[PDB]
Amino acid sequence: IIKEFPEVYFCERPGSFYGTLFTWKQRTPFEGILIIYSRNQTVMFQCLHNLIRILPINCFLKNLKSGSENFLIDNMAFTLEKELVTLS
Amino acid sequence: IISKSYKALINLVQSEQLVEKIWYRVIDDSLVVGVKTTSSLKLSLNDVTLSLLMDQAHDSRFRLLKCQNRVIKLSTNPFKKECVQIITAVTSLSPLLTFSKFCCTVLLQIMERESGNCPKDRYVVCGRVFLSLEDLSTGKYLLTFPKKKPIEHMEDLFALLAAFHKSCFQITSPGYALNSMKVWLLEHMKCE
């Protein structure tokens, strides 16, 4: 762990994962979110494979292009509320 | 009957081993596949290439797969004398590990240049390369630097000579002599 930023993890395993950074926000400790900075995508596949092998049977991964589901629903809710307020 | 007719196709289109054997490495995000020729295949007379073909069982989609080809001649203890020509192809990996796995086929095409009839365009299916993330996770085909310094499988060397950027310089000293080079190489660069 980087002391200055304890939400960042630098992998020291000495072949094909060295110099790989994670971050891990565990919001609502069922529903966490993980971000993988890697030097190519072979390492991102090599890392997800190693993670899927470890996880439970029900642990459902999902990729995010453009933000987290809770945040997008909150955003849509707020926008519609403003629109309906404006039409009222 | 289906077996019989496969063999019938094969003899329909058409003995001395034009190719010893196949090997493949992974460097970082490249696959390097190479095949080592024999006396019979004369690269002076024959343009050769090396295509890779994805099994459509894995490839549900129209990903064009691209491959850059090098030839590699290395002389064997010149200090007759054996040369070694080998033929190599380099492509990206990450387009191919979508299904954790893939099984390419390796196709060596040969086209002669002397005869302007376009007559003799041979082909050879030299093998079939499997990779998987379960294989890479145990090393076994990767090249990862320094711990694998002492190179005792020569395929590692041919992979580095195929993947890497090659540039060739000529050096001329018109008014001194040139004996700094072995020293620059052995002492300043500490070369094996």
Query: Nearest C-alpha of chain A: how many angstroms from B136?
Result: 8
**Which residues are bridge partners to B89 per DSSP?**
B33, B69
Shortest CA distance from B141: residue in chain A: A16
Q: What Å distances lie between residue B116 and B41, B112, B113, B121, CA to CA?
A: 19, 9, 7, 12
DSSP B68-110: EEEEEEEES----PPEEEEEEEEEESTTTGGGSEEEEEEEEEE
Residue whose token pair is 């196949």: B22
Q: Nearest CB to A16: which of B97, B100, B142?
A: B142
CB proximity B16 to A under 8 Å: no
Pick the closest to residue B58 from B129, B154, B161 (CA basis).
Answer: B129
Terminal-to-terminal C-alpha distance of chain A: 52
d(CA B85, CA B74): 7
CB proximity A39 to B under 8 Å: yes
Who's near B80: CB < 8 A, 6+ residues apart?
none
d(CA A47, CA A20): 10
Q: Pull the structure tokens for residue A11.
A: 């992998």
**Which method was used?**
cryo-EM
The one-letter amino acid at B68: Q
Q: Judge contact between B116 and B55, C-beta under 8 A.
A: no
Helices (H), ranges, chain B: 2-13, 133-136, 154-163, 181-183
CA B57 centroid distance within chain: 25
d(CA B112, CA B125): 18
Interface test with A, best of B26, B133, B140 (most A CBs within 10 A): B133
Subunit contact B26:A42, Cβ cutoff 8 A: yes
The one-letter amino acid at B176: Y
Q: Pull the structure tokens for residue B27.
A: 């460097």
List the resolution, Å: 3.1
Instruction: Give contacts of B 59-98 with A, CB under 8 A.
Output: 93-94, 97
